[PDB]
Amino acid sequence: ESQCRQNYHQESEAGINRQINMELYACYTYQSMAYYFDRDDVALPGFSKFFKNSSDEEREHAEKLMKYQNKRGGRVVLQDIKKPDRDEWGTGLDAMQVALQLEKTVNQSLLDLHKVADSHQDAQMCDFLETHYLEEQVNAIKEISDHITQLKRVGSGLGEYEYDRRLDS
Amino acid sequence: ESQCRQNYHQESEAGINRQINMELYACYTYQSMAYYFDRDDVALPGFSKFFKNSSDEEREHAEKLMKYQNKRGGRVVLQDIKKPDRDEWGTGLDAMQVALQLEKTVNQSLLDLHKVADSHQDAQMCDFLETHYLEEQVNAIKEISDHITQLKRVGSGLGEYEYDRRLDS
Amino acid sequence: ESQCRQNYHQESEAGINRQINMELYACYTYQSMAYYFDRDDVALPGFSKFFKNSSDEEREHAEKLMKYQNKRGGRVVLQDIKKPDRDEWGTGLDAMQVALQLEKTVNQSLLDLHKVADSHQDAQMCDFLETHYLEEQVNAIKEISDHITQLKRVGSGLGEYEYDRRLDS
Amino acid sequence: ESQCRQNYHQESEAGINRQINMELYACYTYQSMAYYFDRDDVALPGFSKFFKNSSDEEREHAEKLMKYQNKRGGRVVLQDIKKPDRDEWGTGLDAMQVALQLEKTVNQSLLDLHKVADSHQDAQMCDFLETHYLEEQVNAIKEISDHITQLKRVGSGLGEYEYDRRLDS
Ligand SMILES: [Mg+2]
Ligand SMILES: [Mg+2]
Ligand SMILES: [Mg+2]
Ligand SMILES: [Mg+2]
């Protein structure tokens, strides 16, 4: 047992490892979207930039959990990063819709993880998740939802082009 | 009853006073370590600096709880500050090992205090402890644990000298 | 067929996708090493920094190939990122030794890929690999080899500590 | 024979002269497009700017080959610059489509020229073409392909106007 470990349940430790893989899964999916929008037959560089940035942030989310695992004296155990669900992601609206459901899946996983920590009276881990993950997901879900609504507003063709400009600017 | 007081249980108030004395106890122990390493027959000025800084921070932890007691309308009641457990603290590794167990004792006390506040639905006090005390203890326990591991790595003699340089720099 | 595509053989396109997954595999392995050295019972922050930086660079190598695939009109096809070969990586010397063999495996893969492009007279892809991948691997293999030799020179304990300082500085 | 000349085959020298005329042919065609889009009944100043810049760059490509011919001790032999294939170039999309096929024709010519140099083991000329011509063509073909895809996305009328703004900005 780690000389660090205190009030840290084995279930919370395993849930951290589960969340780490989920953050990496999201990172990989956003990276796929980024280079899908970089295809010559898609050519939406603002959408590409938005999902590239989303992918970098998910990588940061994963590493912060890796750091936290070690802080508490748990042990990082990594698993395969599953390839994304699709190879092509359709229109800008299609990809934002996928991104919304992905962010909500990550949020549900974090809420489940918070329930685990709370069930073991892990007050510090609960605050860590609230501060560094739960607030971010609410903001990210609202932001993408706004993108979806705007993308439906502007429609296909020129509208998608104009919104890509917004994401590039 | 204080014109301030609201949702503040007498047990939470008494637990704050208990934590105050514990923070002061840690302050005094680190101060002892600081001037132990300043002995001419010990002569480890980086270890001295590290524990001097640790002592100043524990004094700050105590005062912030004193401030918080008044914010909530509780009343600060001070007790004797017990002299440290030892007069001499051995090697740099020995003192870090003591520091780890002290920090874990402070952390257990804070976790107990958090359970008291939570049992009385004192949501604000719980957040105060999480934000200003529980995160710090996890970081401090990890930092000292890293020091212990490095101090075992470098060994006695020149190794202890070199790590003292690191702490001085 | 992509409106871009010219002098780009399907085998070269598939080899790019193979190299992409290999770069991501190396990225993941270095990330594992980074947080292994961040364990409280390992506590080698310079080694951690070196492999964190190595992981970021491998991620960049992957994305540049993703970009190149699209430039030529090929289509990025991603596969699972296999978890690293180990969960723990031993001493600093052990991890550098693993890193050397990983870099040589990546280099062999790139040399094979270069042979594929050259067999199809893909002069531009050959230059792209030479400029952005083959030179880097020779430099990276020499750098890690120097680390291994120095790590054997300094030995275990204090020596490993001192070399960690070098990597942190 | 030039006092410079070394490992420079007469076929490579003649191929350089062929490429020079082709670069000048592209320069002239882009210049035509530039002033077509400057017509009062076309009035697309961003498209005009894009093709003006393309024309200047093709002129630079030609001169660098002229310089290279002399460096190797070959002799520049110029031929008529054939007038462009059309006098009017249609919509912005039409002109980008022509530009794509022109760039691919230049790229095929360069690949053929590279095969000539490589067949005579002219390693330096091969590197010169790879470094200064083959990479540029891949980037230029991808860029124009992205323009075509975006121009189809935005459609005629206002869409063409908006993309002209992008090219002007
Ligand atoms: Mg995330
Ligand atoms: Mg304290
Ligand atoms: Mg690489
Ligand atoms: Mg040219």
Side-chain angles (χ1 to χ4, degrees), chain C residues 11 13 21 23-24 28 37 57 77 90 96 107 113 135 154 166:
Chain C
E11 292 178 11
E13 177 181 358
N21 188 265
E23 302 293 341
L24 298 172
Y28 204 14
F37 284 105
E57 289 186 0
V77 182
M96 284 295 178
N107 198 28
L113 183 58
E135 181 180 57
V154 302
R166 184 196 198 97

Side-chain angles (χ1 to χ4, degrees), chain D residues 23 58 61 106 137:
Chain D
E23 302 293 341
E58 297 298 339
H61 300 172
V106 173
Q137 288 314 105

Side-chain angles (χ1 to χ4, degrees), chain B residues 142 145-147 149-150 153-154 158-159 162-163 165-166, chain C residues 38-45 157-158 160-162 165:
Chain B
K142 175 62 159 72
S145 293
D146 289 357
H147 289 319
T149 296
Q150 283 270 64
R153 168 176 290 110
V154 302
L158 178 54
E162 287 294 340
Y163 207 79
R165 276 183 64 237
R166 184 196 198 97
Chain C
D38 179 68
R39 289 172 47 160
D40 79 90
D41 56 2
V42 179
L44 287 170
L158 178 54
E160 180 182 62
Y161 165 90
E162 287 294 340
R165 276 183 64 237

Side-chain angles (χ1 to χ4, degrees), chain A residues 23 58 61 106 137:
Chain A
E23 302 293 341
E58 297 298 339
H61 300 172
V106 173
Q137 288 314 105

Side-chain angles (χ1 to χ4, degrees), chain D residues 4-70:
Chain D
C4 293
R5 198 186 186 114
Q6 183 170 31
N7 198 34
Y8 196 50
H9 195 282
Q10 284 179 325
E11 292 178 11
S12 308
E13 177 181 358
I16 290 290
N17 284 329
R18 189 183 59 75
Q19 193 61 41
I20 284 168
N21 188 265
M22 179 144 208
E23 302 293 341
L24 298 172
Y25 177 87
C27 172
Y28 204 14
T29 284
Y30 283 138
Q31 196 178 58
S32 174
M33 290 183 175
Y35 286 93
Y36 167 78
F37 284 105
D38 179 68
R39 289 172 47 160
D40 79 90
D41 56 2
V42 179
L44 287 170
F47 280 91
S48 189
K49 170 183 291 177
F50 174 84
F51 289 119
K52 169 47 170 173
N53 287 336
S54 300
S55 174
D56 296 341
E57 289 186 0
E58 297 298 339
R59 183 161 189 255
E60 290 172 345
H61 300 172
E63 297 202 342
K64 179 179 278 174
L65 288 165
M66 286 184 241
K67 188 75 175 181
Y68 185 73
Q69 184 75 288
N70 282 339

